[PDB]
């Protein structure tokens, strides 16, 4: 209401600025859980199949053999985590399951992964997997 003066000042200041993204970096690659190893007869759930962005070749997929892999999700209640006492800021409904890359699959860059002591749940099919850069050989 007769306060066009505020909108008059904002235009005059307007210079060329950009968003510039200076935030906490991500140190992993994005993959997806395609499914389990299977044939026409049925599936074996002890091995999972993972497809990673920009990895489209068997030679590419060999680079990741041995790297660690994570599936992040959430539950309904807050339960125990690592550093539950030392760092109370970590406490949440967020949880993760860990595994390792074992070998490539096919010629197109898919890889086989094995999880620690148990199978990954089938509710993760079609969802995101983190593939880290460690342990490192470089």
């Amino acid at each position: 209401h007769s306060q066009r003066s505020k909108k008059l000042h904002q235009l005059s200041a307007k210079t060329s600025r950009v968003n510039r993204n200076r935030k906490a970096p991500r140190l992993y690659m994005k993959g997806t859980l395609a499914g389990y190893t299977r044939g026409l007869h049925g599936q074996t759930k002890q091995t999972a199949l993972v497809r990673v962005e920009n990895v489209n070749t068997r030679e590419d997929a060999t680079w990741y053999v041995g790297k660690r892999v994570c599936y992040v999700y959430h539950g309904k209640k807050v339960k125990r985590c690592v550093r539950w006492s030392k760092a109370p800021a970590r406490r949440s409904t967020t949880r993760a399951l860990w595994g390792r890359v074992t070998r490539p699959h096919g010629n197109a860059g898919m890889m086989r992964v094995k999880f620690n002591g148990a199978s990954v749940p089938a509710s993760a099919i079609g969802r995101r997997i983190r593939v880290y850069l460690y342990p490192s050989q470089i």
Binding site: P25, R26, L133, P135, S136, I138
Partner: protein, 142 residues
């Protein structure tokens, strides 16, 4: 030579003192530091930022959580950092470690400045590494 001797190591040649490394995990993930030495008995590496540039103090780190690039800085600092410096009894920094930090960092900064390409190396140490959409780290040289 003897495996029981503390001098015995198996570290890969890329992680040699003076090499500039990228941190892959921990509180300082993504920062770049300088490898000072490896602790005895085939122990971890010790790295420092220096803390003026990127804020990374003297710290132990496993060589499996590091990428050792081919860029190097010539270091001839006193390097009097044993295992006891990082062992503690059963914003707050002790007056001994606080002094050791300065004694090392001044020498490290003098070495970087004395090096050619010193300004570029300082900026390189100040920058932060990240994985962008569309990136393919498996295809790169380091």
């Amino acid at each position: 030579v003897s495996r029981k001797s503390p001098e015995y190591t198996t570290l890969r040649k890329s992680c040699a003192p003076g090499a500039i490394a990228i941190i892959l995990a921990g509180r300082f993930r993504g920062r770049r530091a300088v490898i000072l030495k490896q602790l005895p008995h085939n122990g971890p590496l010790v790295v420092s930022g220096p803390m003026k540039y990127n804020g990374v103090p003297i710290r132990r780190i496993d060589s499996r959580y590091v990428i050792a690039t081919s860029t190097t800085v010539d270091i001839s600092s006193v390097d009097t950092a044993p295992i006891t410096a990082e062992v503690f009894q059963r914003t707050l920094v002790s007056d001994a470690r606080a002094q050791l930090q300065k004694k090392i960092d001044a020498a490290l900064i003098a070495a970087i400045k004395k090096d050619a390409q010193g300004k570029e190396k300082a900026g390189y140490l100040r920058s932060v590494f990240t994985v962008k959409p569309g990136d393919a780290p498996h295809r790169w040289n380091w």
